[PDB]
Design a protein around this ligand. Structure first.
Ligand SMILES: [Ca+2]
Ligand SMILES: [Ca+2]
Ligand SMILES: [Ca+2]
Ligand SMILES: [Ca+2]
Ligand SMILES: [Ca+2]
Ligand SMILES: [Ca+2]
Ligand SMILES: [Ca+2]
Ligand SMILES: [Ca+2]
Ligand SMILES: [Ca+2]
Lengths: 150, 155, 152
């Protein structure tokens, strides 16, 4: 009797594994990218930094925060697909010249374009990632592709 | 006799498989609802991102296995309001007083258990407003069903 | 034992709760850009692309271009095409042997819904297939841009 119930439960779990795997592919197409235990997903539209940041936070995640070459390449895929530069979560709003994650932690990885960050006009505290994957500091008031990470 | 050992192993394996599914699915729920969904309690609102007349909007939700947004509490209404605000487009609710003027009901025929009418509403303006729209401020207003509003379904 | 059945019953409760949550999130997932039919799921990207680019998007996503293999699957796909009011590309081509359409695997068609007079290989250069809002098929040049719909 027990073995019968266990084998039934085994069947339910096996079905869920197959169904879940199929569903993951469906969900990620065409606005998501999975890399490691992280998932990037674009909203498909642009917003100023503050608005983009709130959208990600309210959704239970945060703005894209690539921490390795692998994560950056994954994010770049979405930027390329939408052909629109996107905002990252990091800023040097607290201390000019020092970029940090929303927590306050210093960067553990960076992929700055040549000469960046340059605080152009003395007012660039946010970061955007181009279609080539390189980063550039940009005015937080500009509108860029919204991409969150979960 | 000691066959319980093999069954034991199977159970221990299942526990690990279930924990994996739970963790993985917890993450995908958040991913899935961004940026067009909103969960509240055990209900989920999902917008199509475009506008349609009531009849068309109703059919879209029903064919999808759900129904038009039907907030049953202040909390559900506020959750729906978040989507409407984000899209900046008033949306249709599921209720109408098409059967009996002045009496709004859900698609099932049940009378409303919650409402958030703007002052003076419903007013059946022009004697032809049997559908309901929710504004970006969360308030309700009866509106002509032929008008086009944001499509938001609940699942 | 007893301590095992209690464990199984508790675990099964969790699994059935998971089955319920999953079912709900699946319906949410498919609205409004997807459609399920049998064990297959169609999902549109919501934009148009030339065949090669569309085929790459689906492959990279772990699926392939829409490949209706029955009247039921074709009707399901038709719903998305109608909803978007944009004809979409199917996965099949007759690039290897003109006049003989096959799936990406090389297998011959097991179902077709060609519009009257098709496939005609117009201009002697139509090796891809599009499905209209009326559900009928027509061979079209692969370089044209059509709605991207993948199947999983
Ligand atoms: Ca500064
Ligand atoms: Ca700066
Ligand atoms: Ca700069
Ligand atoms: Ca009336
Ligand atoms: Ca009325
Ligand atoms: Ca009114
Ligand atoms: Ca040819
Ligand atoms: Ca041909
Ligand atoms: Ca033709």
């Amino acid at each position: 009797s027990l073995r019968q119930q266990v084998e039934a439960l085994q069947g339910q779990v096996q079905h869920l594994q197959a169904a879940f795997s199929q569903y993951k592919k469906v969900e990620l197409f065409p606005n998501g990218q999975s890399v490691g235990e992280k998932i990037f997903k674009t909203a498909g539209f642009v917003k100023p930094f503050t608005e983009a940041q709130l959208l990600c936070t309210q959704a239970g995640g945060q703005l894209a925060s690539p921490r390795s070459a692998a994560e950056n390449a994954a994010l770049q895929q979405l930027v390329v697909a939408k052909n629109e530069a996107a905002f990252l979560s990091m800023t040097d709003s607290k201390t000019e010249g020092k970029f940090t994650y929303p927590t306050g932690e210093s960067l553990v990885y960076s992929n700055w374009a040549p000469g960046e960050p340059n605080d152009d006009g003395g007012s660039e505290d946010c970061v955007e990632i181009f279609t080539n994957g390189k980063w550039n500091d940009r005015a937080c008031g500009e509108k860029r592709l919204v991409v969150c990470e979960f």
